């Protein structure tokens, strides 16, 4: 199978095959994902040896997708190991892990009262919006911009957030498998996807970030979300969320895709929130 990006067509022959003998698995991280070494530290995405032909093409497509991107806020691909079984996709090891687990585990707590501040959250949001802007200007529609699909370079203050998973854009599973909680009305009703699909999803990711890793639409099922969103329903601000941050979310959630901001506008608004002392001086809630 072939793949086209930035006006250039590529094939499996363009993937950087890393000799299997050079790869060593260290631990399971959560097909399985392992921490590995090539010394270069890597996250090893594996293809189960017992899989369908569609699973193989999906895996090969994902390798092509990630290898052709070149941006600071998109996970790097070191190479692949497709000439040995199980097949491997070699990614940049992101020591901070996924954004969802990070937010949940690093929540300000009585023991860690200042573990995260509004500025840490704004920096993550900017980093992903910068990755989204690169995808938008390269006419790539992600389809699942969500905390679970983002990674961090380290747990510390100099962390860099990156988009780490491209399984959804690759697929294009059933109804209860569509990430309807991250989807705008024209995507779940008409199956229409544009650059404005990622804007809506980004607003939901912003809610995930500022809620510190909660599941969107608390207590609502997929069908309830579908009906809620269709009827003009929107999420409330996460706890202690400054008004200017929530305003970015509600602009991302405009019913008409044309009324939703592009990522250059999102980045300008995130930048303004970081400069605003009334935003960054707001204390995050302390979980008991």
Ligand X SMILES: C[C@H]1Oc2cc(cnc2N)-c2c(C3CC3)nn(C)c2CN(C)C(=O)c2ccc(F)cc21
Catalytic residue IDs: 144
Reduced to 3 states (helix: H, G, I; strand: E, B; else coil), residue 244 is: helix
Per CB under 6 A, does 62 bind ligand X? no
Measuring CA to CA, which residue among 234, 43, 208 is closest to residue 124? 208
Check the annotation: does 165 bind a ligand: yes
Per CB under 6 A, does 98 bind ligand X? yes
Which region among 52-60, 93-101, 107-115, 266-274 touches ligand X (by CB under 6 A)? Answer: 93-101
DSSP string, 98-136: EHHHHHHHT---SSSTTS--HHHHHHHHHHHHHHHHHHH
Measuring CA to CA, which residue among 48, 50, 69 is closest to residue 59? 48
Output the CA angle 40-42-43, nearest 5 degrees: 175
Which region among 65-73, 85-93, 116-124, 226-234 touches ligand X (by CB under 6 A)? Answer: 85-93
Which region among 18-26, 89-97, 200-208, 272-280 touches ligand X (by CB under 6 A)? Answer: 89-97
Measuring CA to CA, which residue among 18, 169, 2, 162 is closest to residue 88? 18
Residue in this structure with the two tokens 């961090």, named with its chain if needed: 152
38-43 CB contacts, 8 Å cutoff, 24+ apart: 38/78, 38/79, 38/90, 40/78, 41/93, 42/78, 42/90, 42/91, 42/92, 42/93, 43/90, 43/91, 43/92, 43/93, 43/94
Q: State the nearest-atom distance from the C-beta of 43 to ligand X, in Å.
A: 3
Reduced to 3 states (helix: H, G, I; strand: E, B; else coil), residue 277 is: helix
Site residues (CB under 6 A) for ligand X, limited to 1-60: 29-30, 33, 43, 45
Residue in this structure with the two tokens 């989204």, named with its chain if needed: 132
Q: State the nearest-atom distance from the C-beta of 59 to ligand X, in Å.
A: 12
Selected binder of ligand X within 75, 187, 209, 212 (CB under 6 A):
75
Residue in this structure with the two tokens 């094939």, named with its chain if needed: 11
Per CB under 6 A, does 64 bind ligand X? no
Which region among 97-105, 208-216, 241-249, 278-286 touches ligand X (by CB under 6 A)? Answer: 97-105
Q: How many residues bind ligand X (CB under 6 A)?
A: 18
Site residues (CB under 6 A) for ligand X, limited to 143-172: 149, 151, 164-165
Per CB under 6 A, does 127 bind ligand X? no
Of the pair 41, 282, the CB lying nearest ligand X is at 41
Site residues (CB under 6 A) for ligand X, limited to 207-246: none
Annotated binding residues for ATP = 45, 92-94, 165
Task: Kindly list the residues in this chain that would bind ligand X in the complex (CB under 6 A).
Answer: 29-30, 33, 43, 45, 75, 91-95, 97-98, 101, 149, 151, 164-165
């Amino acid at each position: 199978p072939n793949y086209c990006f930035a006006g250039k067509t590529s094939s499996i022959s363009d993937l950087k095959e890393v000799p299997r003998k050079n790869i060593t698995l260290i631990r399971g991280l959560g097909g399985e994902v392992y921490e590995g070494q090539v010394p270069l530290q890597v996250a090893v995405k594996t293809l189960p040896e017992v899989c369908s032909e569609q699973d193989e093409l999906d895996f090969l497509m994902e390798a092509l997708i990630i290898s052709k991107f070149n941006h600071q806020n998109i996970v790097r691909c070191i190479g692949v190991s497709l000439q040995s079984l199980p097949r491997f996709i070699l990614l940049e090891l992101m020591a901070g892990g996924d954004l969802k687990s990070f937010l949940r585990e690093t929540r300000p707590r009585p023991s860690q009262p200042s573990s995260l501040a509004m500025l840490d959250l704004l920096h993550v949001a900017r980093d992903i919006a910068c990755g989204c802007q690169y995808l938008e200007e390269n006419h790539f529609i992600h389809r699942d911009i969500a905390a679970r699909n983002c990674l961090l370079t380290c747990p510390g203050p100099g962390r860099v957030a990156k988009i780490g998973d491209f399984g959804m854009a690759r697929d294009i599973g059933g109804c209860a498998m569509l990430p309807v909680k991250w989807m705008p009305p024209e995507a779940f009703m008409e199956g229409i996807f544009t650059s404005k699909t990622d804007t809506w999803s980004f607003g939901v990711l912003l809610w995930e970030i500022f809620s510190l890793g909660y599941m969107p639409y608390p207590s609502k099922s997929n069908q309830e979300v579908l009906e809620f969103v269709t009827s003009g329903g929107r999420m409330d601000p996460p706890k202690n969320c400054p008004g200017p941050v929530y305003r970015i979310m509600t602009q991302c959630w405009q019913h008409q895709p044309e009324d939703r901001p592009n990522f250059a506008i999102i980045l300008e608004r995130i930048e303004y929130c970081t400069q605003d002392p009334d935003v960054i001086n707001t204390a995050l809630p302390i979980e008991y």
